[PDB]
Enzyme design. Structure first.
Site, PDB file in Angstrom:
ATOM      1  N   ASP A  25       0.843  -1.232   0.000  1.00 50.76           N
ATOM      2  CA  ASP A  25       0.000   0.000   0.000  1.00 50.76           C
ATOM      3  C   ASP A  25       0.880   1.285   0.000  1.00 50.76           C
ATOM      4  O   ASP A  25       1.300   1.754   1.048  1.00 50.76           O
ATOM      5  CB  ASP A  25      -0.876   0.051   1.234  1.00 50.76           C
ATOM      6  CG  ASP A  25      -1.951   1.155   1.110  1.00 50.76           C
ATOM      7  OD1 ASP A  25      -1.816   1.947   0.149  1.00 50.76           O
ATOM      8  OD2 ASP A  25      -2.867   1.141   1.931  1.00 50.76           O
ATOM      9  N   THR A  26       1.069   1.892  -1.177  1.00 46.45           N
ATOM     10  CA  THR A  26       1.823   3.148  -1.294  1.00 46.45           C
ATOM     11  C   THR A  26       1.115   4.292  -0.626  1.00 46.45           C
ATOM     12  O   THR A  26       1.781   5.323  -0.273  1.00 46.45           O
ATOM     13  CB  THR A  26       2.089   3.549  -2.739  1.00 46.45           C
ATOM     14  OG1 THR A  26       0.825   3.760  -3.411  1.00 46.45           O
ATOM     15  CG2 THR A  26       2.857   2.444  -3.449  1.00 46.45           C
ATOM     16  N   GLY A  27      -0.151   4.116  -0.294  1.00 47.21           N
ATOM     17  CA  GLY A  27      -0.876   5.271   0.271  1.00 47.21           C
ATOM     18  C   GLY A  27      -0.782   5.186   1.811  1.00 47.21           C
ATOM     19  O   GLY A  27      -1.178   6.142   2.506  1.00 47.21           O
TER      20      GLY A  27
HETATM   21  C1  LIG Z   1      -3.636   1.875   6.828  1.00 46.78           C
HETATM   22  C2  LIG Z   1      -3.503   3.216   7.450  1.00 46.78           C
HETATM   23  C3  LIG Z   1      -2.043   3.302   8.104  1.00 46.78           C
HETATM   24  C4  LIG Z   1      -4.596   3.358   8.526  1.00 46.78           C
HETATM   25  N1  LIG Z   1      -3.626   4.273   6.450  1.00 46.78           N
HETATM   26  C5  LIG Z   1      -4.763   4.442   5.748  1.00 46.78           C
HETATM   27  O1  LIG Z   1      -5.820   3.765   5.866  1.00 46.78           O
HETATM   28  C6  LIG Z   1      -4.662   5.606   4.831  1.00 46.78           C
HETATM   29  C7  LIG Z   1      -5.575   6.730   5.348  1.00 46.78           C
HETATM   30  C8  LIG Z   1      -5.463   8.016   4.439  1.00 46.78           C
HETATM   31  C9  LIG Z   1      -6.291   9.212   4.930  1.00 46.78           C
HETATM   32  C10 LIG Z   1      -7.796   8.865   4.908  1.00 46.78           C
HETATM   33  C11 LIG Z   1      -8.134   8.417   3.453  1.00 46.78           C
HETATM   34  C12 LIG Z   1      -7.210   7.262   2.904  1.00 46.78           C
HETATM   35  C13 LIG Z   1      -5.679   7.688   2.998  1.00 46.78           C
HETATM   36  C14 LIG Z   1      -4.819   6.496   2.586  1.00 46.78           C
HETATM   37  N2  LIG Z   1      -5.055   5.262   3.464  1.00 46.78           N
HETATM   38  C15 LIG Z   1      -4.453   4.055   2.869  1.00 46.78           C
HETATM   39  C16 LIG Z   1      -5.409   3.419   1.875  1.00 46.78           C
HETATM   40  O2  LIG Z   1      -4.543   2.725   0.936  1.00 46.78           O
HETATM   41  C17 LIG Z   1      -6.477   2.573   2.564  1.00 46.78           C
HETATM   42  C18 LIG Z   1      -5.830   1.248   3.013  1.00 46.78           C
HETATM   43  C19 LIG Z   1      -6.905   0.229   3.281  1.00 46.78           C
HETATM   44  C20 LIG Z   1      -7.059  -0.820   2.355  1.00 46.78           C
HETATM   45  C21 LIG Z   1      -8.034  -1.746   2.544  1.00 46.78           C
HETATM   46  C22 LIG Z   1      -8.848  -1.738   3.714  1.00 46.78           C
HETATM   47  C23 LIG Z   1      -8.723  -0.682   4.614  1.00 46.78           C
HETATM   48  C24 LIG Z   1      -7.665   0.269   4.428  1.00 46.78           C
HETATM   49  N3  LIG Z   1      -7.485   2.246   1.510  1.00 46.78           N
HETATM   50  C25 LIG Z   1      -8.737   2.658   1.567  1.00 46.78           C
HETATM   51  O3  LIG Z   1      -9.239   3.333   2.514  1.00 46.78           O
HETATM   52  C26 LIG Z   1      -9.567   2.193   0.325  1.00 46.78           C
HETATM   53  C27 LIG Z   1     -10.480   3.322  -0.022  1.00 46.78           C
HETATM   54  C28 LIG Z   1     -11.413   2.900  -1.189  1.00 46.78           C
HETATM   55  N4  LIG Z   1     -10.878   2.877  -2.335  1.00 46.78           N
HETATM   56  O4  LIG Z   1     -12.608   2.575  -0.937  1.00 46.78           O
HETATM   57  N5  LIG Z   1     -10.408   1.085   0.804  1.00 46.78           N
HETATM   58  C29 LIG Z   1     -10.427  -0.053   0.056  1.00 46.78           C
HETATM   59  O5  LIG Z   1      -9.869  -0.148  -0.997  1.00 46.78           O
HETATM   60  C30 LIG Z   1     -11.260  -1.175   0.558  1.00 46.78           C
HETATM   61  C31 LIG Z   1     -11.573  -2.319  -0.185  1.00 46.78           C
HETATM   62  C32 LIG Z   1     -12.422  -3.254   0.450  1.00 46.78           C
HETATM   63  C33 LIG Z   1     -12.893  -3.029   1.757  1.00 46.78           C
HETATM   64  C34 LIG Z   1     -13.707  -3.958   2.448  1.00 46.78           C
HETATM   65  C35 LIG Z   1     -14.132  -3.666   3.759  1.00 46.78           C
HETATM   66  C36 LIG Z   1     -13.739  -2.494   4.392  1.00 46.78           C
HETATM   67  C37 LIG Z   1     -12.919  -1.598   3.721  1.00 46.78           C
HETATM   68  C38 LIG Z   1     -12.536  -1.852   2.408  1.00 46.78           C
HETATM   69  N6  LIG Z   1     -11.740  -0.986   1.785  1.00 46.78           N
END
Ligand SMILES: CC(C)(C)NC(=O)[C@@H]1C[C@@H]2CCCC[C@@H]2CN1C[C@@H](O)[C@H](Cc1ccccc1)NC(=O)[C@H](CC(N)=O)NC(=O)c1ccc2ccccc2n1
Ligand SMILES: CC(C)(C)NC(=O)[C@@H]1C[C@@H]2CCCC[C@@H]2CN1C[C@@H](O)[C@H](Cc1ccccc1)NC(=O)[C@H](CC(N)=O)NC(=O)c1ccc2ccccc2n1
EC number: 3.4.23.16
Lengths: 99, 99
Positions: A25-27
Site C-alpha cells: 500500500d503506497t498510500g
Molecule cells: C492503513 C492506514 C495506516 C490506517 N492508512 C490508511 O488507511 C490511509 C488513510 C489516508 C487518509 C484517509 C483516506 C485514505 C488515505 C490512505 N489510506 C491508505 C489506503 O490505501 C487505505 C488502506 C486500506 C485498504 C483496505 C482496507 C482498509 C484500508 N485504503 C482505503 O481506505 C480504500 C479506499 C477505497 N478505495 O474505498 N479502501 C479499500 O480499498 C477497501 C476495499 C475493500 C474493503 C472492504 C471492507 C472495508 C474496507 C474496504 N476498503
C-alpha cells in the site's frame, strides 16, 4: 517483480513465524496487521483511516519478510480488514511506483 | 517517473480548471477526492477503509490529469481527509509497483 494494478497488490508475507497475505500500500504511512500476538512490549496508539481513527497496539523493530525480502520496523496491530504493508517497510525493500 | 516511497507519493491533479494534489494509492480500489460537485449525474454510495465508511457521490466519465497524464473514469466525491488516486485510474496511467 513488476506488479500491475488490475487487481489488488497482495503478496505473501511471513511474520511471527506465520505465512499470511498482505496488501502493498503506497498510500499507507504505517504497516498494520490483523489481531495477532507479537513479541516485546507494545504501546497503545490511534491511527486514522478513511472512516475515522482506530485503537491499535504499536510494536517496534518487528521482522517481516515481504515477498521473500526482509524488512524490520514498527508494526501496528488492530482491527484492520486486511494486513497492509505501508511505506515504512516498503522503502526497505526498494519498492517504487513507475509510470 | 520512478518514485521512491520515503515520503508520500503526492502528485498534482487537474479536474475541471481546479488544480489539486492527490496521493497515488496502491491500497485503494477507488479514486476519492474532496470536490465541490463535478458536472453530471451521480448516485450515492458508501465506501470504506480503516475506521469504517464514508458517504460519497459517484461520478462516471470524469476527465482528470494525474501528474501530466490524462485519465477518464469514475471519481468518488466526499469527505476524505486526503485526496486519493486508486487503482481504477492508476491502471489507466500505466502505473506499476516494482521491487
Ligand atoms: C492503513 C492506514 C495506516 C490506517 N492508512 C490508511 O488507511 C490511509 C488513510 C489516508 C487518509 C484517509 C483516506 C485514505 C488515505 C490512505 N489510506 C491508505 C489506503 O490505501 C487505505 C488502506 C486500506 C485498504 C483496505 C482496507 C482498509 C484500508 N485504503 C482505503 O481506505 C480504500 C479506499 C477505497 N478505495 O474505498 N479502501 C479499500 O480499498 C477497501 C476495499 C475493500 C474493503 C472492504 C471492507 C472495508 C474496507 C474496504 N476498503
Ligand atoms: C473469508 C471468510 C470465511 C469470511 N473468513 C474470514 O474473513 C476470516 C475470519 C477470521 C475471524 C474474523 C477476523 C478475521 C479472521 C481472518 N479472516 C480471513 C482473512 O485472514 C483473509 C486475509 C486474506 C485476504 C486476501 C487474500 C488472502 C488472505 N481475508 C479474507 O478472506 C477476506 C475475504 C476476501 N475476499 O479476501 N478479506 C477481507 O475481508 C478483506 C477486506 C478488505 C480488503 C481490502 C483490500 C484487500 C483485501 C481485503 N480483504
Amino acid at each position: 517483480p513488476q506488479i500491475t494494478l488490475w487487481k489488488r497488490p497482495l503478496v505473501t508475507i511471513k511474520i511471527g513465524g506465520q505465512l499470511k497475505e498482505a496488501l502493498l500500500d503506497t498510500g499507507a504511512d504505517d504497516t498494520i496487521i490483523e489481531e495477532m500476538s507479537l513479541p516485546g512490549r507494545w504501546k497503545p496508539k490511534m491511527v486514522g483511516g478513511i472512516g475515522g481513527f482506530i485503537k491499535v497496539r504499536q510494536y517496534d523493530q518487528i521482522i517481516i519478510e515481504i515477498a521473500g525480502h526482509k524488512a524490520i520496523g514498527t508494526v501496528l496491530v488492530g482491527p484492520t480488514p486486511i494486513n497492509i504493508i505501508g511505506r515504512n517497510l516498503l522503502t526497505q525493500i526498494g519498492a517504487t511506483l513507475n509510470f
